[PDB]
Amino acid sequence: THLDVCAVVPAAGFGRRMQTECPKQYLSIGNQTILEHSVHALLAHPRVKRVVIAISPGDSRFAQLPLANHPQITVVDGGDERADSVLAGLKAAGDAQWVLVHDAARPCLHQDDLARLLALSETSRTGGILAAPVRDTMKRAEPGKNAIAHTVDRNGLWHALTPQFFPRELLHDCLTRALNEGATITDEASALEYCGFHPQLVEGRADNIKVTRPEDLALAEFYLT
Amino acid sequence: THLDVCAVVPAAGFGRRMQTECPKQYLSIGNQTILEHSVHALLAHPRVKRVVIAISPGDSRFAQLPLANHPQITVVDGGDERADSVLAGLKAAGDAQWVLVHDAARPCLHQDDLARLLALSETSRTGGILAAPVRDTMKRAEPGKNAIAHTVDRNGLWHALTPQFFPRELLHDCLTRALNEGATITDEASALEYCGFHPQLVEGRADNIKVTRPEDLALAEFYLT
Ligand SMILES: C[C@](O)(CO)[C@H](O)COP(=O)(O)OP(=O)(O)OC[C@H]1O[C@@H](n2ccc(N)nc2=O)[C@H](O)[C@@H]1O
Ligand SMILES: C[C@](O)(CO)[C@H](O)COP(=O)(O)OP(=O)(O)OC[C@H]1O[C@@H](n2ccc(N)nc2=O)[C@H](O)[C@@H]1O
Ligand SMILES: [Mg+2]
Ligand SMILES: [Mg+2]
């Protein structure tokens, strides 16, 4: 039972950066929706016993997918921001000791990256995330201007990706505390950070992209080909 | 003569992150090398009168390209690091008032992005660069560990791309000074920054990628399709 993992997939975003009245997670690549691609990647690993998917209360396309009746899938309503949807998913996680949180919008997840992340439960007490090294020179803009303030050192700088793997109750409590104290939480690692922890960085493939913009769809298809 | 622009293309990298004994800039996409794609993008704009390409002293494939005999192209030897190759190119720029520096490895440059960058000479005294907003949550790693120190705010954070457009002598002098004082210079904007300036950020397409890794080739082809 120690190895059992519960997954949480925040998929309640309206994605108004997609322009289309059709959510990005519901767009299709091959014979499946982006959401299904993401969920099947998690279900592909033996340890992932359950997947909790958080959707919008006004979401009516989920019930029309094969996942709707899957014995390992549980559906709950998400919240205003990603962190809220993730929290609602965590509350239905169960007794699982460890939780995997993965964006519905990242359908290109490979099994090797996933297995390497999952190994953290046997070598870590706080958990970690998949991540990709920064390549371009990075620039910090001036507060209210489109001019360069200074360069941000790309060395030691990483792109946070998902899944993000953490002990269930610890993540639950850190996220609740951060949100209650009105902190800025853009991922799960951010919640552990707010509570004083420092999650591990597990290098994953950079082709594990997030589909948010219209063009992202085409690119995601390319990678899945 | 005020509008005349000289371009500098650093292409002296051995690219040992490509694995192949064949430099990334010399790989082919369609009926052309990556280098030719990059150079033609600059030559496509009327203002770009000359292009100085910096290559490795041991580079023997350049002379076998059609660009070798192009009336607008000048070839010089590059240096140990990118900043050195760029400096050598600048010394052969001529009397051009403004210089455009573009990585040989970024063949997906679009004309609209280029024209918007070039407009800076009529609205700026210091210049600017093409850049793309950061999307993922960013993480700063701990000095000697693969653990997260803290999150780096993605708001106001940009991916520096190229071309980078600056007054010729100013760039020349700032780069010389920075290099002499042993500063870290990963792009041209960094040199103006070292001398106290703050270049403008011009949003460009994120598909204007840099080909450094083996897989980058395939992706670049996709974008050029
Ligand atoms: C977690 C990271 O991938 C780490 O780089 C990013 O911080 C996510 O950044 P992001 O701006 O939150 O990205 P988005 O594409 O808007 O959202 C990622 C996932 O959160 C979900 N989401 C977003 C807002 C919301 N109220 N409920 C949600 O369930 C989206 O449906 C999507 O599957
Ligand atoms: C300028 C930026 O694109 C801004 O994001 C990056 O800072 C460049 O970062 P980078 O690590 O320098 O990237 P690379 O792919 O190794 O180099 C970009 C360009 O510099 C050239 N280059 C590199 C090293 C060297 N001694 N001479 C060169 O002329 C390469 O040939 C390539 O066309
Ligand atoms: Mg959002
Ligand atoms: Mg280099």
- Domain range summary for chain B, segments of one domain joined by +: 1-225
Q: How far apart are CA B23 and CA B11, in angstroms?
A: 9
Q: Which atom of ligand 1 is nearest to the CA of A162?
A: 3
Cα(B158) to ligand 2 centroid in Å equals: 17
**B60: how many CB neighbours lie within 10 A of its CB?**
9
Question: Rounded to a whole number, what is the largest CA-CA distance in chain A?
Answer: 54
A210 touches chain B (CB under 8 A): yes
Q: Within 13 Å and on the Cβ side, how many CA atoms surround B164?
A: 26
Q: How far apart are CA A166 and CA A172, in angstroms?
A: 9
Cα(A196) to ligand 1 centroid in Å equals: 23
Q: How far apart are CA B85 and CA B67, in angstroms?
A: 19
User: Residues B11, B102: contact at Cβ < 8 Å?
Assistant: no
Amino acid at residue number B51: V
Tokens of A113: 């990256």
Q: What sign does the dihedral A9-A11-A15-A20 (CA atoms) show?
A: positive
Q: How far apart are CA A40 and CA A70, in angstroms?
A: 11
Q: Which CATH class is domain A1-225?
A: alpha beta
Amino acid at residue number B203: E
Q: Which of B75, B87, B141, B105 lies closest to A131 in space, CA to CA? A: B141
Contacts of A144 (CB under 8 A, 6+ apart): none
Q: How many angstroms away from the CA of A35 is the closest CA of chain B?
A: 19
Alpha-carbon B171 to chain mean position: 14
Ligand 1: residue of A82, A102, A209 to mutate (most ligand atoms within 8 A of CB) is A82
User: Residues B101, B7: contact at Cβ < 8 Å?
Assistant: yes
Q: Which of B73, B56, B57 lies closest to B8 in space, CA to CA? A: B73
Resolution (A): 1.8
Burial of A158 (0-12, 13-18, 19+ CB in 10 A): buried
Helix, strand or coil for residue B24? helix
Q: Which method, experimentally, gave rise to this model?
A: X-ray
Q: How many angstroms away from the CA of B148 is the closest CA of chain A?
A: 5
